[PDB]
């Protein structure tokens, strides 16, 4: 039944999935709403599914690397069920993108450029980097997946491309990196004994701690700047600083929850912003 | 199983007659040029720089054989020559500055797959054996490299229809670089390898190769399927955007 394959479907997710895939889309649509004043639900759902599907396909590209050793769901898995699901997810993504073209007023070339350059660019280098350096390749993915999802959603919504969504989507990329780094630090010794290398293993424990703290606290500086210099109504994400201090004092579920709340308040900040008070908006 | 036979045929037929294929292809290139001296300067500069970064980033003489570096150099010369001649002679001379980061990086990248075939070839002992090894190396490395080149050419290709001029030019150079690399790797790289190994038998890399080549060289099965779907999608984008638009 469906519940017996929900375990198969949870294989393509990670603790940083909701944030990295679904927060950008909401931000992008909020920016599109602020810029133009008309939002479309159909395109919003389409962008959400397309970005989530592509991210899932990439997670399965990584999941397949856990068959080298018995790292491994309440069933027997083997390397056909992963391949089939990867193909199905990516095909779903492409069908969604085709639907978005048909519904939206964006040019096919720009849509293809974003969707096959940015979102699906991970597949071009990942695969044949080995099983050891799968975690190191993830940083570059999560740096270049956060902003591109925002802009993809924004462009599809409005009908023309723009540069500023990449600038507005820095905090989300940083907080997502903090989640990934935190989860890497959590599995330091296991990865060390297994032969896997991550950033936390390479830089050491104290540098991983300072890097964690940097990646956690940069968003709040960016929100304070963007508050005091552009629009005061954007200052909501500073309200969750007690949680950030609690996280810093207790050093990934709580980090993931923090990111979720940061993202929510950042979207509520963007929506409530006055008309004309935001750069290029 | 179907494609491997065809690539094995190609590898064998190229490696069997090295000199005739290499002179024929060089003739074809200079014919394409002449029918329609800065080429040498750009070839040399580009070659030295690319070969030097590869020479550095890869650990010098880690295996204990310089033939790999010689073969890599002879690959780089031809790749850079074939790229440079088109850039200088045909496209635009004045527009070749500061956006040669992508072609510069793609060759660094494509050198590994050229070195692989050299490692496949060097483990031989006899002349018929080295020809057979080149054939098997080609049969293994051909399909994957073809797919990689195709998808890269189509992605960077769709980059050339954006509207932003700088992106159009950079992407155009990217596509030319990929096609030059693939053309050189297929046509007259194995001829060069075969000829170098024929005209010169202290090549001892048998056991490591014959245990790890058919295991360590294997890509990720998910990536390959996604690349095939990307390829198909981009072919539809290109067909529509160029003919129906």
């Amino acid at each position: 039944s469906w519940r017996q394959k929900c375990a198969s479907y949870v294989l393509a997710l990670r603790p940083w999935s909701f944030s990295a895939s679904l927060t950008p889309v909401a931000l992008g649509s909020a920016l599109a709403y602020r810029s133009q004043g008309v939002l479309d639900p159909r395109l919003l759902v389409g962008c959400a599914v397309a970005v989530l599907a592509v991210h899932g396909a990439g997670n399965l590209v990584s999941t397949y690397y856990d068959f080298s050793k018995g790292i491994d769901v309440d069933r027997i898995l083997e390397p056909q069920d992963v391949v089939r699901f990867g193909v199905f997810l990516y095909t779903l993504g492409c069908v969604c993108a085709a639907c978005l073209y048909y519904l939206s007023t964006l040019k096919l070339e720009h849509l293809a450029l974003i969707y096959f350059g940015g979102l699906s660019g991970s597949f071009l280098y990942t695969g044949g980097i080995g099983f050891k350096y799968v975690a190191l390749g993830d940083l570059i993915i999560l740096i270049t997946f956060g902003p591109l999802a925002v802009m993809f959603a924004y462009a599809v919504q409005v009908g023309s491309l723009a540069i500023f969504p990449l600038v507005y989507a820095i905090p989300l990329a940083l907080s997502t990196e903090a989640i990934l780094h935190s989860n890497n630090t959590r599995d330091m010794e296991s990865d060390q004994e297994a032969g896997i290398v991550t950033l936390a293993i390479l830089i050491g424990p104290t540098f991983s701690y300072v890097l964690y703290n940097t990646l956690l606290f940069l968003p709040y500086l960016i929100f304070s700047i963007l508050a005091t210099h552009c629009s005061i109504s954007l200052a909501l994400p500073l309200l969750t600083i007690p949680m950030a201090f609690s996280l810093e004092r207790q050093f990934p579920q709580r980090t993931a929850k923090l990111n979720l709340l940061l993202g929510l308040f950042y979207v509520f900040g963007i929506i409530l912003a006055p008309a004309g008070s935001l750069p290029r908006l | 199983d179907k494609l491997s036979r065809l690539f094995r045929m190609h590898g064998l037929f190229v490696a069997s007659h090295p000199w005739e294929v290499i002179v024929g292809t060089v003739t074809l290139t200079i014919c394409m040029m002449s029918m329609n001296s800065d080429i040498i300067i750009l070839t040399i500069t580009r070659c030295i720089a690319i070969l030097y970064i590869y020479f550095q980033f890869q650990n010098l003489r880690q295996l204990g054989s310089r033939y790999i570096l010689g073969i890599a150099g002879l690959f780089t010369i031809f790749s850079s020559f074939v790229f440079s001649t088109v850039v200088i002679h045909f496209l635009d001379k004045e527009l070749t500055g500061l956006n040669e980061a992508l072609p510069f990086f793609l060759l660094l990248i494509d050198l590994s797959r050229a070195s692989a075939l050299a490692k496949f070839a060097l483990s031989s002992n006899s002349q018929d054996e080295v020809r057979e090894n080149i054939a098997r190396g080609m049969a293994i490395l051909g399909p994957t490299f073809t797919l990689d080149a195709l998808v890269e050419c189509l992605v960077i290709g769709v980059g050339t229809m954006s509207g932003v001029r700088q992106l159009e030019i950079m992407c155009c150079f990217g596509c030319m670089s990929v096609l030059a690399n693939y053309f050189v790797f297929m046509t007259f790289f194995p001829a060069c390898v075969s000829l170098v190994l024929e005209l010169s038998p202290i090549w001892q890399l048998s056991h490591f190769a014959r245990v790890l080549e058919e295991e360590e060289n294997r890509p990720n099965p998910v990536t390959q399927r996604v690349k095939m779907i990307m390829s198909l999608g981009l072919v539809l984008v290109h067909a529509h955007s160029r003919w129906i638009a």
Partner: antibody
């Protein structure tokens, strides 16, 4: 229709090494694992290990880590097992077993046994 | 190495009568059990996957039950084609471990 055709009996001497073949046929050989099972005299089954046919990344049971080495031949659709340093307690059947087609199946397709005799 | 145990070693029955085996694990293994049937001079064949779910090509008289640690297989009415050894396998944690095996008798 999947069928796993396995090699015939093997009468051998002590201290030697022995190679077994299980020619897989009727499906995409490179998709599923190729497990191995030992049935001793007394009829008590034991799990040896597996091998991913695409890469070749094996994964053994700890007991059989030293004296069982699984190899694969992608060209001819054949999975191999090499037993080394045989003793009196290796006279046993060896099955090559594989999981079902759909997700969530257990080990349907077994071989037929290679009656090794030390 | 989860130790699986089984409780008649040899089990005598009469044609028509209901039979019941038991595969008592050494750990909470969920619904991860598989009951194989091995006749004289053959390979084991699957009967009940995951302690409950039936198999296509098996007669309907074979049914399983139980969860957690203690499992059970049952045959409604035995015939001359149900005289074999039955092994329970767990697929929860590597390495997989078969049971001792229960033989039947008329």
């Amino acid at each position: 229709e999947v069928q796993l055709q396995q090699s015939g009996p093997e009468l051998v001497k002590p201290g030697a090494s022995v190679k077994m073949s299980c020619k897989a046929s009727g499906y995409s050989f490179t998709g599923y694992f190729m497990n191995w099972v030992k049935q001793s005299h007394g009829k008590s089954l034991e799990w040896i290990g597996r091998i991913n046919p695409y890469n070749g990344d094996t994964f053994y049971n700890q007991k059989f880590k030293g004296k069982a080495t699984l190899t694969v031949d992608k060209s001819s659709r054949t999975a191999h097992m090499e037993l080394r340093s045989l003793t009196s307690a290796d006279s046993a059947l060896y099955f090559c077993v594989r999981r079902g087609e759909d997700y969530g199946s257990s080990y349907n397709y077994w071989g037929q046994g290679t009656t090794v005799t030390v | 190495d989860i130790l699986l145990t089984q409780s008649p070693a040899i089990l005598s029955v009469s044609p028509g009568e209901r039979v019941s085996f038991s595969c008592r694990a050494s750990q909470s293994i969920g619904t991860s059990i598989h009951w194989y049937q091995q006749r004289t001079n053959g390979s084991p064949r699957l009967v009940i996957k995951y302690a409950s779910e039936s198999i296509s090509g098996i007669p309907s008289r074979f049914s399983g039950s139980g969860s957690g640690t203690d499992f059970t297989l049952s045959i409604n009415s035995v015939e001359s084609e149900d005289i074999a050894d039955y092994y329970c396998q767990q697929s929860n944690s590597w390495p997989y471990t078969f049971g001792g095996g229960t033989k039947l008798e008329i």
